[PDB]
Design a protein around this ligand. Structure first.
Ligand SMILES: Oc1ccc([C@H]2Sc3cc(O)ccc3O[C@H]2c2ccc(OCCN3CCCCC3)cc2)cc1
Ligand SMILES: Oc1ccc([C@H]2Sc3cc(O)ccc3O[C@H]2c2ccc(OCCN3CCCCC3)cc2)cc1
Lengths: 243, 243
């Protein structure tokens, strides 16, 4: 991923974008009958498959070992889901667009114990993105930095192959950084506004980590088996027979 | 804090640095007799007082309302402790320098249930800083961004005064960003290495948030009363009689 221009990275990234999925409940039946967490859980599960495919199309991600790819995803999947939710809810003040047929507001989160607290953080993130006028080209860069950054510091020990992995990841990170600055420059930002905006975007990533951590806390004590590792492994370790 | 040059900010920041404290146990008595968590808890508590004083010397922090100052600290105090620990352990590979008389390695963390996992993250952060050759001028900027950034997105609602607060904080953030770039430029980094290094530093902040969250999780289930808010309030809401 370190020979691709800023322009090839952005195009590679927009190309790789996953689809928008729909929630699965009969829209002919009433809403008092559906488990919101079941509806949200089931939505999240189906996105995971598409996330795995997206990640293989991120420049540099497949040059990694299968084990490392599983590690990065196992660390970042909730942050990745959450930055996607915030981005599609941007133009929907006061509401989170889980799916086009599932637009939920703050009181709708009160339905499940301790959830409105997560909602409130997600909605405020969305608010910030709106206010910053985050662009679609910038968002794809952000989402890819989260995939690459979130588990780089928790690789177990550090064998020689482990060291090259980390080196490789940091070099893809630098390239996406080059790409953000490039996108900002092309949009006519002064040098100063550039570094400033880069920093405001990257600091947002610290709030998303926060919501994910909080989110895992809340999930770990609900209904929503195989380790997530093992399931990620099966999904990523695919054959090439279907070529 | 938005009329201070990059140079005044750095000097203001180095000036404000808290002291290095010592652990409190008789070094004439054996180590099998001391509660490590009690030793660590007691150390952390004493640093908190000094942290509150430091924060009042960060450019722009006291222009905030008392309530907002308490909110920022209540969100960031563990991250602030942790980035300080990582920084002083930098030149102590494989070990965390909690205090000059309390240098602990990875097996020393195994002593308390679920702690070596936190140790392992802290030590890897320290490793990264070493490898990046983080400078003391850069570290102070980072520590101040954490104070200012970590709770900006969780201010409750948003009254007019709330909006000006956020505006003010974001403007101090931009200034510290200007200061990092300035520090990097002065050190002879190319424009490119600059934005790159800014990004590598800010992405580190996402790991520190992670360790803090994990850390709160682990603390919430141990020995280590008044809300932390109330206690922060008492510490910050001081009279000026002692002038
Ligand atoms: O504490 C929290 C945390 C997260 C959430 C939200 S966020 C969210 C984001 C999406 O893109 C899709 C759905 C969605 O619903 C909740 C969501 C529900 C269940 C989730 O996961 C549980 C099941 N599963 C996920 C995929 C890997 C295997 C475990 C993930 C998100 C609400 C409360
Ligand atoms: O799960 C974890 C989390 C953190 C820790 C570590 S980190 C750390 C960093 C320092 O600068 C000082 C001591 C220190 O010890 C532990 C530490 C122990 C207790 C702490 O706080 C408990 C008591 N107290 C802190 C101040 C506010 C009131 C509550 C904070 C850090 C170890 C395990």
């Amino acid at each position: 991923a370190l020979s691709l221009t800023a322009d090839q990275m952005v195009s590679a990234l927009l190309d790789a974008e996953p689809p928008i999925l729909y929630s699965e409940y009969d829209p002919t039946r009433p809403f008092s009958e559906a488990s919101m967490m079941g509806l949200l859980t089931n939505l999240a599960d189906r996105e995971l498959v598409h996330m795995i495919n997206w990640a293989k199309r991120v420049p540099g991600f497949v040059d990694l070992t299968l084990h490392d790819q599983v590690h990065l995803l196992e660390c970042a999947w909730l942050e990745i889901l959450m930055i996607g939710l915030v981005w599609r809810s941007m133009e929907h003040p006061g509401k989170l667009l889980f799916a086009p047929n599932l637009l939920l507001d703050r009181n709708q989160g009160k339905c499940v114990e301790g959830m409105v607290e997560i909602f409130d953080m997600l909605l405020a993130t969305s608010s910030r993105f709106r206010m910053m006028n985050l662009q679609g080209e910038e968002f794809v860069c952000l989402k890819s930095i989260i995939l690459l950054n979130s588990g780089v510091y928790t690789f177990l020990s550090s064998t020689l192959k482990s060291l090259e992995e980390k080196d490789h990841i940091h070099r893809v990170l630098d390239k996406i950084t080059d790409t953000l600055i490039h996108l900002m420059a092309k949009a006519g930002l002064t040098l100063q506004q550039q570094h400033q905006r880069l920093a405001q975007l990257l600091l947002i990533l610290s709030h998303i980590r926060h919501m994910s951590n909080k989110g895992m806390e809340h999930l770990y004590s609900m209904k929503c088996v195989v380790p997530l590792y093992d399931l990620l492994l099966e999904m990523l370790d695919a054959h090439r027979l279907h070529a």
